[PDB]
Amino acid sequence: LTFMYDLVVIGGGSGGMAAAKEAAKYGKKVALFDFVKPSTQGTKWGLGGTCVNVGCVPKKLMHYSALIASSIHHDAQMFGHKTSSSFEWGKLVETLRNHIRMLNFSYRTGLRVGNVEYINALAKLIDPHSVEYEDNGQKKTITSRYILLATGGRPSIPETVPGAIQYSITSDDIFFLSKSPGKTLVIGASYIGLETAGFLNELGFDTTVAMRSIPLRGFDRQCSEKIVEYMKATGTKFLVGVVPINIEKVNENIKVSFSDGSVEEFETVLYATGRNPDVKGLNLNAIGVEVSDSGKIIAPKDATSVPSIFAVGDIVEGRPELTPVAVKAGILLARRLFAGSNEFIDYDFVPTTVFTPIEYGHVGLSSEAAIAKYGEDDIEEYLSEFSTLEIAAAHREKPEHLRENEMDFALPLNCLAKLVVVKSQGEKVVGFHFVGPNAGEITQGFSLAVKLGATKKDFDDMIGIHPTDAEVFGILEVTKRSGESFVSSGGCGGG
């Protein structure tokens, strides 16, 4: 038949490698293109895309290093381990690089063994069935029944702010810096911004976040603000309603001029203001692939305006930019194309965890989205704010430069549990929220239970595992409406 391939995948990240391997499982001929355009600062990397190289994986290793710093500062001596420690940025980088190298190789092999032809070049569309790449500086064209776009995004730097592109780094550079970043400015109170600032502060760097308005826009306000309260109490500085308007090299430092007329010097400036979909090189306009006002491909069912051309992951408008969503969309697409499946993701139940110094895991609706959808009177919020048992016994203290009196000694309680329930459906759980340690580990299971239609009664009749934080979800009784105190001061942990 008139096609060299059954499936050509442009992009070897979470979406692309998943689609490609699953297609190849059904005896289909599959080619995958992945090439890394260097960052605004010349950083590049191997196969596996944003999550493997410059996202979830390295961020989680840096978070782990941060939790180790925190445990050593706050906890080690109290639990009988008298420790002296010094942090060496280049050692942590070296451990990240070595683990990511192992994963680059692991994914190359996974593709070859999985009968996918991997090509390390930039691909572009020629027509609805044809893709072009260079190979020894010689354009080649290959034909496919089906084409999948999964090119992901890259960090966005404001072109209007002078010096930004030249002098600032992004998430593409932060995990691999040859030198420690020293005094750091992070612009963006997005999850990437807060996570990045959170681990740089925990690791002992002088850290400042420029937050234009509010933290974690779209996320539950109560939880988003508890995180910022905790980050402030552990030494992150926040400029609220302020952004850079100018960025200059003054000798070895970066002089940043702020929108409130203030000035401050930093060693490192990192933009975490968002990401644009990397689609400009794809030749979408000429082929008839429709894009939204944001530049994202219109494909609410993975199918673009061109019926031989599909898209998944961060480049698709109206879906969360998360790795598991990219992967499962790639696998389900592969099955629908080649195994007679008609299964899509249920986008109502996409859980997420933010890996801030205390983590935040949720699925379903914030208090705000719940109140907006069902009305204030059909909503109950059950919640509890408490300390992990082990942390309670550690007596974690504020740095002495942030003390306000003789009874402000303690860090905030590390945990917050909240269920958002609809009264007119026997208190059905429509929102689950947990701030605290291991929040992703806690939320995964609860997210399944919430998807299966768990009620507040189901949560009350649930037997707890003791001692855990997650057992708190079985004895929540204080409501926001009641106006009574949701703090628990006694240290039984999750209760």
Which residue among 117, 267, 278, 380 contacts ligand FAD (CB under 6 A)? 278
Rounded distance between C-alpha atoms, residue 163 and residue 254, angstroms: 10
User: What is the chain's alpha carbon radius of gyration, rounded to the nearest angstrom?
Assistant: 24
For residues 452-471, which are near ligand FAD according to CB under 6 A? 466
89 binds, among a copy of itself, ligand FAD, none (CB under 5 to 8 A by kind): a copy of itself
Q: Are 22 and 160 in contact (CB under 8 A)?
A: no
Choose the catalytic residue: 74, 99, 362, 466.
466
Q: Is there binding between residue 113 and a copy of itself (CB under 8 A)?
A: no
Rounded distance between C-alpha atoms, residue 154 and residue 50, angstroms: 9
Rounded distance between C-alpha atoms, residue 128 and residue 143, angstroms: 9
By three-state DSSP, how is residue 196 classified?
helix
Return the number of the residue (150 or 203) whose C-beta is nearest ligand FAD.
150
Q: Is there binding between residue 118 and a copy of itself (CB under 8 A)?
A: no
For residues 324-363, which are near a copy of itself according to CB under 8 A? 324-328, 330, 343, 345-346, 349-353, 361
Rounded distance between C-alpha atoms, residue 51 and residue 34, angstroms: 14
For residues 182-211, which are near a copy of itself according to CB under 8 A? 203
For residues 28-57, which are near ligand FAD according to CB under 6 A? 33-36, 49-51, 54-56
Rounded distance between C-alpha atoms, residue 304 and residue 290, angstroms: 7
Rounded distance between C-alpha atoms, residue 475 and residue 495, angstroms: 8
Residue 321 C-beta-side C-alpha neighbours within 13 Å:
21
Q: Is there binding between residue 360 and ligand FAD (CB under 6 A)?
A: no
For residues 169-208, which are near ligand FAD according to CB under 6 A? 171, 192
Q: Is there binding between residue 362 and ligand FAD (CB under 6 A)?
A: no
Return the number of the residue (37 or 457) whose C-beta is nearest ligand FAD.
37
372 binds, among ligand FAD, a copy of itself, none (CB under 5 to 8 A by kind): none
Q: Are 154 and 36 in contact (CB under 8 A)?
A: no
- 51: enclosing H helix or E strand: helix 49-54
For residues 74-103, which are near ligand FAD according to CB under 6 A? none
Rounded distance between C-alpha atoms, residue 366 and residue 377, angstroms: 15
Rounded distance between C-alpha atoms, residue 326 and residue 16, angstroms: 8
Q: Is there binding between residue 446 and a copy of itself (CB under 8 A)?
A: yes
Q: Are 433 and 352 in contact (CB under 8 A)?
A: no
**Shortest spacing between CB 171 and ligand FAD, in angstroms:** 4
- Complete DSSP assignment for 474-491: GS---BTTT----B--S-
Return the number of the residue (93 or 243) whose C-beta is nearest a copy of itself.
93
Rounded distance between C-alpha atoms, residue 130 and residue 282, angstroms: 12
Encoded tokens for 290: 């429709």
Which residue among 27, 42, 80, 261 contacts a copy of itself (CB under 8 A)? 80
Q: Is there binding between residue 59 and ligand FAD (CB under 6 A)?
A: yes
Counting residues that bind ligand FAD (by CB under 6 A) gives: 35
Return the number of the residue (267 or 278) whose C-beta is nearest ligand FAD.
278
Q: Is there binding between residue 16 and ligand FAD (CB under 6 A)?
A: yes
277 binds, among ligand FAD, a copy of itself, none (CB under 5 to 8 A by kind): none
Active site residue 99: no
**Shortest spacing between CB 284 and ligand FAD, in angstroms:** 11
Q: Is there binding between residue 7 and ligand FAD (CB under 6 A)?
A: no
Cite the beta strand spans of 161-202 per DSSP E. Answer: 184-187
Rounded distance between C-alpha atoms, residue 225 and residue 358, angstroms: 12
Return the number of the residue (316 or 421) whose C-beta is nearest ligand FAD.
316
Which residues in 441-460 are b (16+ Cβ under 10 Å) and which e? ebbeebbebbeeebbbebbe
Q: Is there binding between residue 316 and a copy of itself (CB under 8 A)?
A: no
Q: Is there binding between residue 99 and a copy of itself (CB under 8 A)?
A: yes
Q: Are 307 and 324 in contact (CB under 8 A)?
A: no
Site string for ligand FAD, 320-359 (x = CB under 6 A): -xxxx-x---------------------------------
Residues marked active site are found at 466
User: Interface with ligand FAD by CB under 6 A: which residues?
Assistant: 10-16, 33-36, 49-51, 54-56, 59, 122-123, 150-152, 171, 192, 278, 281, 313-314, 321-324, 326, 466
